[PDB]
Structures are given as C-alpha cells and as structure tokens.
C-alpha cells in the first residue's frame, strides 16, 4: 500500500519524537490504507556549518527511536553515514536510509543491504534519473530485496533545486519510488550558514507527485518548525499533516486510473 514516511528531521529529543509519534500513530489509525513509517535522523552528518546542530549521537538516537516503535508500534527509518552504523541501526530501523550525497558510496549501500532490512536511497542532486539503475543493482548484489529510490530534487544552478517529475516514471522501472516533499523545496546553502526553502511549494508539488504517480511520500514534520534545529524553513507544521495526507489520497484515488504501466 501507499507509503507515508514522516517525522521530525532530527532527533532533537526523545520527547519531540514521542509527541510527533503520537500524531503519526493517530493518523495511522485513521488512514488504514496507508503504511506510515516514522523517520528522524540521529545525526545530521552533512550540515553546511560546523556550528550547526548535529544530534545526540547514535546510541541516544537508536534508543529514542526504539521508544517510538515500542510505544506506538510504528515502523522506523533513519539514515546512516558510514558503513559501521548499518548494523546497530538495523536493530530498530525497518528501512535504512542512504543520504543523497552518499548515494554512490558502494560500501555504505552494501553495509545497509547486508542487514537484511529495506533500503531507501535518496537520489543525489547530481544524479540523472536513469543513473539510479546502477544504484539498485549494487543493493541487489548486496542482498537487498525491498528497495526504494527517493526523489528530492536536482541541482539547478546555484543554491536551488528543481524537481524533474519525469524521474518518477523512469525510476519506477527498477524500484519503488518515494517523493521527498520537504527537501525538494529547500535551497542548498541558501542562508549562508544554513539552507533555505519555500514552504509554500510543499503542498503544490506533493499534489503533482501523486498525480504523476509514486509509491509513497516523505515529509519532514515538526510541531513548531520555526523552532526546529534543522530545516526550520521547510519542515511541515505537525497540525497540517492530516489535511495533506487526505488530499493526496483523494488525488491518488482519481489519478491512479491513469498511472502508466511500468
């Protein structure tokens, strides 16, 4: 069924995770035809500035994520940054996420595939849609069986990303496709010390994604984005999540009749 990956960008505290997890659990009960996966990074290993928030470490993160899965019975997903992290993360993560900048790092992909867990690779901003075929092949070689590719924008001049929706049907040829609705509108290094983005385009573009056809969507959501320690300009207010989900489900219901085969 349709996948909805959502949660706060970074694990600012297990408290934050629980509050968001409580809402995702509620929507999970309201939208039975949707498979929700809770997401949150234990480390922002690629911040632009050395002085920006990274996190509380892998152990605290994996612990907080365990709390969410045990308390709400929600599937989990988080990203890894170096090969050694795959094993400990797989203890809780149902889906191991591979960062966009690291989508070509062979050992990271193999490490993730070896855990036996599902793997979701963020398509690098430097990659062409057809270049992802090789990515999937590495994962299959590594033993991965459940593989996802996430569209999160492509480099378009400086400090800007564009979403080429032709990528959805192209990547669908070799993997399930997820559309990252929040990172696709961010402006890389847009604010000098941090990245920017236009929240006003999150909804319009997610509607486009389901109209074109995808297997799921990815959304960063925070109770108060303004106070977020990461992606404060792009995380979706928690309260607006329900409305957006219902909206894309309705559009998908009507549009699905026209999704092209393979």
């Amino acid at each position: 069924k349709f996948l909805v990956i959502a949660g706060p960008c970074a694990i600012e505290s297990e408290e934050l995770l629980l509050k968001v997890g409580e809402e995702i659990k509620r929507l999970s009960e309201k939208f039975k035809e949707v498979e929700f996966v809770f997401k949150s990074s234990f480390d922002k290993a690629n911040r632009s500035s050395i002085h920006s928030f990274r996190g509380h470490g892998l152990e605290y993160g994996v612990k907080a994520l365990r709390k969410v899965k045990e308390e709400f019975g929600l599937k989990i997903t988080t990203d890894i940054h170096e090969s050694w992290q795959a094993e400990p993360v797989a203890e809780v993560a149902d889906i191991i996420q591979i960062p966009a900048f690291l989508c070509r790092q062979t050992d990271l992909l193999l490490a993730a595939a070896k855990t036996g867990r599902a793997v979701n690779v963020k398509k690098g901003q430097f990659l062409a849609p057809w270049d992802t075929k090789n990515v999937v092949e590495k994962l299959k070689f590594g033993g991965a069986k459940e593989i996802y590719l996430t569209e999160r924008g492509t480099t378009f001049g400086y400090n800007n990303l564009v979403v080429d929706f032709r990528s959805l049907p192209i990547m669908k040829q070799w993997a399930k496709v997820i559309y990252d609705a929040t990172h696709s509108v961010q402006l890389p290094g847009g604010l000098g010390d941090k990245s920017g983005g236009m929240r006003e385009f999150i909804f319009p573009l997610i509607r486009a994604a389901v109209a074109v056809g995808c297997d799921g969507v990815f959304m960063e959501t925070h109770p108060e984005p303004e106070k977020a320690l990461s992606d404060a300009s792009t995380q979706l207010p928690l309260s607006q999540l329900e409305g957006i989900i219902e909206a894309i489900l309705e559009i998908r219901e009507v549009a699905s009749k026209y999704y092209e085969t393979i």
Copy 2:
C-alpha cells in the same frame, strides 16, 4: 472559472488538416461544455533549427485557413506572431495572439499584440525565471492588454533538454492566468541535430502534474498522424488520444481544486 484548452496542429500544413482537427475539437467542445476550447495552429514556424525544415504557406494562407475553421466550427482561434507588423492582420481572426518563447522579451512585438485589443498569451522563455514574467505582464498592460496569459513550456536544463519547474505555476499566477504547454515541455531542443527531439511518454504524466498543482488551462499540439507531421513529429499528440487526456485532466482538476492555494 472555465478551464482553457488550447489545441490544434503545430503548423498549418494545409487547410484540410485544420478542418480535420477542428472537427474533432468542435465535437469535444460539445461534450466538455465546462471547457473553453481555442483552436491553435502556426501560419509560420519562424524559428526552425534548420533552414531546410518546413515553415508554412505564409500569413495570408494561414489566416484564411484559420478563418475557415472559426467560420465552419465556431471555435475561438489563436496563432503566434513573429514581427510587429503581423499583429494587425492576425488580430482579424485570432481571439488570442500568441508570443513565441524566444520573443517574450521583444517589447515592440508585445506592444503590437496588446494594442489590437485581443487577448495575449506569452510563452515563457526557456531563459526566463518565473518571477521575471512580472515585467512581461507589465509591458502588456502598459500596451493595452486586458486579458493576459503566461504559458509554462519548460526551462533550459543543460544542453538539449528542458525541465519543468512546477513552482512556476503558483508564482506566475500572481500576475496572470497560467497555461501549461504539455507538448513543448517534453521536447529536446535541437536533440535530433537538424531538428528538435522529444519524449512523448512524458506528456501525460506532466500534464497530470500541471492540473494537480493548478493552472488555468493547458496547451496541446495534436495531429491525426504525428509521425507524418512537418514539425514536432516526436511530440504532437495523436488526435485520437485528445478526448481521453482532456477527461483525465478535468477529473484530476476537480479533485485537486479544493486544495488550490489562494494567490
């Protein structure tokens, strides 16, 4: 508001071709009463890549052919102009005067179109940013235009390729009605060397995206037999497929409409 569907053969290959397509558009106009159809065809392809490619049979012949379509089917008409002097004779038949993408910044062409009193539709240049169109609309208003459209037809993305940045739709809506060009947006500029190429398999998915995001109309080139077209043979939609596409976009528009943001 009434959704606009601008459709027709890319170029006026013959008056016979126009009537053939016009007959089908008229039929669909009777079925899709909630749609405002505008028949489109260029009397001249003034910017072909090669000197050896088809251009047309001249303005006189073209306007005459377009007038036959309006007279026989009662359909609104739109065609593009390339130089200022063409605005006047074209306004005689064209309900909407179209400004080519490469010429979207040519002040005199825009002014010539605006003073005719007809509606003006400007194809957004492949070199233009969405917010850059505000000044285009300003020039038109200055010139007397009261009904203005801006058409999204892709942006230069590396060589011989265009990308559609859908953020352009809500941005341009701030100052004009917005049209999505479903066929030119998938063309590969100069892709075939002496001519441009294209990927027809992406026409439908991208048009679904356009209506889900929200626009005021769509623009589609359509030909009975695309493979035999004298221009854009790789991107024109087979006429037989037009009905189905229109029905689909009306359905997606309806379900997504309650979510369209207010500008």
Copy 3:
C-alpha cells in the same frame, strides 16, 4: 587579425559615441595588429522593464554611427531586431549583429545576410554549442560570407549565466568565434527591474577566452558605467580598456602556440 569589438552598450547620444570613438581610435593607432570595430545599439528592444531606456530610434542611431565612422574611420557594428532594419542599418554597419534571443529567427538572419555585410550572431542562452552549426548554415544559404558566432553565456539556473569554454573550440569548426566579455558576467533580471552582473569577473574570464583561443573579443565600454542607461553593472570603464587589450594580446601571443587545429 584579432578582432576587438568595443563601444558603449547603447547610443545614449552621438556625443557619448564620439568620446568613446576617440579612445578606440587612439588604441586602433597603438595596436596595429588588432582590428577594432566600434559597437553601439540604436535600440535596446528587449529590456526587462517597459520603463527602461531603449534609445533614440534607428535614424538618430545610424546617423550617430555614421559620424563615428566618418570622423574616426572606424568599422561599425550594431544589432537589428526585425527584418526591415537590415537594409537601412547595412548603410553604415560593417557587421550586422543578431541579438541572442533572436539567433533562431530565420528571417532576421536572412535579412542580415542579404545586405552583403558580415554577420555576427550572439549565441542564445538556450543554445548548445553544436546547435550553432545550423545558424551558420542559414546565413550561408542567405549569401553571408563573413560569419561570426559570439559566446555570451548560457542559462545556468535562474538569473545566472555560466560560460562553458568548451564552446569556443566547438563553434570554431564552422565560424569565427568572438567572446563577449561583458554580457557573459551579467545576471539576467538580477535586479528585478533590470539585469545585474559582477564586473570583477570580466578580466579573469577574458584572459581565459584568449588562453583557450578565439578570433576576437567583444566589450561594452563607457566613460562612466555607473551613469550608463543600460548595463551599468557590467560596462567596462573606458580608461581600463587599454590595459585589458594589451593583457589579452600578451596572453594570446604565448598561448596561440597551443591553439588546437580546427
């Protein structure tokens, strides 16, 4: 010999043209191994804003340009915007310039070629280097014998241009190549009502052009760019023209040994 096309962007007044023409005449006498061509537009037909400076009309412009050619004996070049302008402009213009946005307008190219004059086409920001082969063919079909292609940057994301220097050797296969040193650093619509640009990159990039190899350079020059009615952010101060010319001639002298054949 090496071509240097220079002059004020727009014909703000025949007075401005004479002052600039006087300096270009002086450099012409100092650099005998260089063929100088005086340039200035009688009309800026593609300004972003309807309220920006366009010019004083074709007649006044052609007249002022005649004054420059007669008073200083300098070759002339100006751009045309519609087919009817080719004939009257050819009365004075040694080289007819075709605007970047209009490089694909067949009738404009043919009109220019019919005059018997040399034709310099600005490569559209939307054109690939190899797409210019067709441009030259149209001109040859139209009777043109002296044909130039000018590199002036390519669309790179929004409101920015990048100079792909690979274009120089590619275009050289079918025409003489000119590098536009001033427009290549302009930021299209950068200031909302007008375009922007970084003057600091004019010199570095022109050095690159001659190191790679070209048949000439194009430079907008004004006594006081700050007061210019067009491209105030990119026109080169008249006083700096001599130094730049000597510099590129020196670099060309050494680098020419390595220019690849054809």
Copy 4:
C-alpha cells in the same frame, strides 16, 4: 608562490604502474624546479557507478605502493579517504589528504583529515556553489587543518554533464589555495551508462583557461596507456603528454601572472 602539480594514475592498478608514472613525475620534477609535484593515486574508487567496475586492491596494498613511490623517488604523496577511520593510516604516507567531491560536506571525514596534521585538499562537490566552500574551509580550520586546498572539478549542468564556472577560482581563493582538476572537469558523469564518459579534447584548452584566470595548482590524472586504464579510461592524460602540458601552463601562467587580481 611555488605552483602545485598533482598528478598520477587515477587508481592504484598495481605498484608497478605507480613506479612507472612516478619515474616520469620525478624526471619532470627535476626539470620544472619551480613546480612542487605531488604524486596522486587512489587506493580505492569507493564511488564507481557500477558494482562491476574496478575499485582497487585495498588500503593496505595502496599505502604500501604509495610509500614505495615516496621512498624510491622522494615525491610528496596524496590520496583520498572515504570514511573517517582511513585518515590515520593514510596520514602515515600522504602529505595531502584528499576529500572526494561527493563527500565534501561530510563533517566527520573532514575532521578526521584535519586532526592528522596533514594538508587537506577538498574536491568541490558538483552540487556546491563557489561561495558554499567558505563553510568547508571553516570546518577544516576548526578541525586543526593549517594547509587547505579547494579543487574545482566542475558543476552539475543538466544530466550527465559538468560545466566549469571559472568565476569559482577567484571566489574560492578568498579562503583557500585553489587547484584546478583538468581531467575530472571534462568527464560526463554516468555518460557510458555503467560508467562515466568524457571528452579528452577539452582537457588542454580548459587547463589553459584555468592558469590564465589564476590558480595555485592543477590536478591531472595521467596513465601510460589511458585506453587500458581500469578507471577513467576516457579522460586520463597519456603520460607522454604530461611534460608538454606542464610547460605550456607554466608559460601561460607567467605571462598572465602580472594580471592576477589581489584577493
């Protein structure tokens, strides 16, 4: 200041290959005394497009091979790291630790390199704007790096293509020494499908542009027989052509140097 020339075979195909190339680099180092040569070769291509492409013979073998080059020829050494743990063993032989382009934002990798006390050269990501490198240098300085280089190797321009924006050289010079990668800048990412392509005919002209604009050094992959290389077979410079290229860039650098702007 002494111009830097970083050169060597893309990958450590064998210790024999390294000595062969090292011998030539040593010879040129004796002729071009005004140049500081640094021998380069990767012990691992950790980011090949295909799982079936050559990667290397491991870190242990590679460091040993590089040490043989330094020992036998007295040349400085540089190689790239892919994960934090590799910094320490690599620092034992590498005078300059290289950070791959895709990993230019990985904080721990940069920190691991900085604390070794060795010089660090970061390949500018194809996704990074020139001014975005200021923060890269800041992280390195924070981590203890005292000798920092930023390498221009092209920027994503549409699909499977890179463009070199030479404005990056003077911009990056504001906070670090700048190196121009003459061979990777002409490669076509994923161009050959299972591997990347490239246009060797543009290597020389673009390197001439780099020195005319002004940089602190150049980076060139060089192999005795490029067509037989196990990586970048389409872009590595034939070893026989290295001498001529170096002489040419030194000549162009000399004549253009009086015009280099002050940062």
